[PDB]
């Protein structure tokens, strides 16, 4: 969310990356290197962890780019936080699993550098809501 | 096109009334309605 | 569809329709309702064909109240048969309806979906209808 010029955001997992399905054409269509990225990516994925890093890549004529990495979707940190494979299909009523007023706060700390709300109650909120977003009631 | 109940189909369509006849004009010709 | 499962007599006289409902002028069930303006016999086929028109419109939503019931046997003589020789046989069933009768009424839905799920049903009826929302008459003090 800065400048724009044929950009193409997209999420990616651990070291695993290159299959055309997830990425592949994902950036090769806008003329680019699946080479200068398949590894260039696993240069920072292998370092931080092995989850799901939302990396939005911009593109120029020199099949160049600026793959900016961010914190995994607030939807991931919330899952494993209660041990849930999928989401829940139909939220708002069935709480497959649940999280506590604190477990939510933890994550909030992990994504506060991405948001735009220093406060830890403000952030935790747009997370406690992410629960009603996948059927995972908040403990409190 | 031509019919008994001529109504609106867009946010872009005027209920023009020319010649005693209630027409309907929109950007896309598919919405050109008249009454008869 | 929707007919009684009894009645003491299989066929009954045509009767007459002198305006003003005998009752059911006020809405005593749901939020918004549908009221008849002109007298007429509504058919079983029509009532149903509007009850679904209703739901289908707002699929998996509120509750619909049907307040008219076709308990009048409607008859008709076969085709190409001449006058006389006994009364025709039952065709289907109708419900008498005079001006002012709140036929239908929906509950637990937005006025957005009310004054629409009704506007549609209205087109399925042989008469003119008007929409209303709970007001003057209520059962209290």
């Amino acid at each position: 969310m800065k400048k724009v010029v044929a950009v193409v955001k997209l999420q990616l997992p651990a070291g695993k990356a290159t299959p055309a399905p997830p990425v592949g054409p994902a950036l090769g269509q806008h003329g680019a290197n699946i080479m200068e990225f398949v590894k260039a990516f696993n240069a920072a994925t292998a370092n931080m962890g092995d989850a799901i890093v939302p990396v939005e890549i911009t593109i120029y004529a020199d099949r160049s780019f600026t793959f900016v990495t961010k914190t995994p979707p607030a939807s991931y940190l919330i899952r494993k936080a209660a041990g849930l494979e999928k989401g829940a299909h139909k939220p708002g009523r069935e709480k497959v699993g649940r999280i506590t007023w604190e477990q939510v706060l933890e994550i909030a700390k992990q994504k506060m550098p991405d948001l735009n709300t220093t406060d830890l109650e403000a952030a935790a909120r747009m997370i406690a809501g992410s629960a009603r977003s996948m059927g995972v009631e908040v403990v409190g | 096109k031509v019919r008994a109940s001529v109504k609106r189909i867009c946010d872009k369509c005027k209920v023009i009334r020319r010649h005693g006849r209630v027409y309907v004009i929109c950007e896309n010709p598919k919405h050109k309605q008249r009454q008869g | 569809m929707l007919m009684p499962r009894r009645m003491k007599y299989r066929k009954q006289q045509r009767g007459r329709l002198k305006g003003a409902t005998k009752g059911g002028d006020y809405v005593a069930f749901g939020d918004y309702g549908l009221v008849a303006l002109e007298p007429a016999w509504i058919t079983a086929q029509q009532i149903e064909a509007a009850r679904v028109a209703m739901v289908r419109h707002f699929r998996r939503g509120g509750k619909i109240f049907i307040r008219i019931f076709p308990d009048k046997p409607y008859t008709k003589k076969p085709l190409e048969v001449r006058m006389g020789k006994g009364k025709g046989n039952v065709e289907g069933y109708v419900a008498v309806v005079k001006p002012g009768r709140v036929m239908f009424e929906v509950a637990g839905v937005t006025e957005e979906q009310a004054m629409e799920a009704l506007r549609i049903a209205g087109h399925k009826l042989p008469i003119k209808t008007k929409i209303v929302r709970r007001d003057a008459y209520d059962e209290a003090q």
Partner: protein
């Protein structure tokens, strides 16, 4: 609220409405009189008023009488009023219907269900000094198949029930 009432000696009810005067009548153990409150005013008033709250009759001769509408009569077709007649208030065990604000948004959510507000209010013994505006029924522990009703409300000081009670004051039912 207040509303300008007047007196009817015996002038054609038809001619009354024709002018705009919806007729009515205040009665009770004592006074029994013909009146003719304006219609538009009355509507505008009784509109949000209902038989739920009291009215003050500002007659043509000082007297400012209390009032608790007893029944508005309709025209059937053209559901409009013909005879709005209000009960004159004393301070006796005046029976009346107290509203019923539920609030709580019970079960029946993703599942759907509907708030069958059966009986949007209820009758009870009280005194004019006590006009118990509303009553409570949160219901959010009651799902679909279930339903509260009888003795399930809270009777504040000066408000007793006139039932049994079994009147299923509300319930929840399935969608479509």
């Amino acid at each position: 609220y207040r509303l300008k009432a007047y007196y009817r000696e015996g002038e054609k009810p038809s001619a009354l409405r024709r002018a705009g005067k919806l007729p009515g009548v205040m009665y009770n153990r004592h006074l029994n009189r013909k009146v003719y409150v304006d219609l538009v005013e009355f509507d505008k008033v009784f509109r949000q008023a209902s038989i739920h709250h009291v009215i003050v009759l500002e007659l043509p001769d000082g007297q400012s009488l209390p009032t608790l509408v007893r029944q508005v009569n309709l025209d059937k077709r053209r559901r409009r009023p013909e005879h709005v007649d209000f009960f004159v208030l004393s301070d006796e065990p005046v029976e009346m219907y107290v509203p019923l604000r539920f609030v709580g948004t019970p079960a029946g959510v993703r599942a759907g269900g509907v708030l069958q507000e059966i009986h949007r209010d209820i009758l009870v013994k009280v005194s004019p000094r006590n006009i118990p505006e509303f009553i409570e029924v949160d219901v959010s522990g009651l799902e679909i198949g279930d339903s509260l009703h009888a003795s399930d409300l809270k009777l504040p000081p000066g408000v007793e029930l006139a039932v049994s009670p079994e009147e299923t004051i509300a319930a929840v039912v399935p969608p479509e």
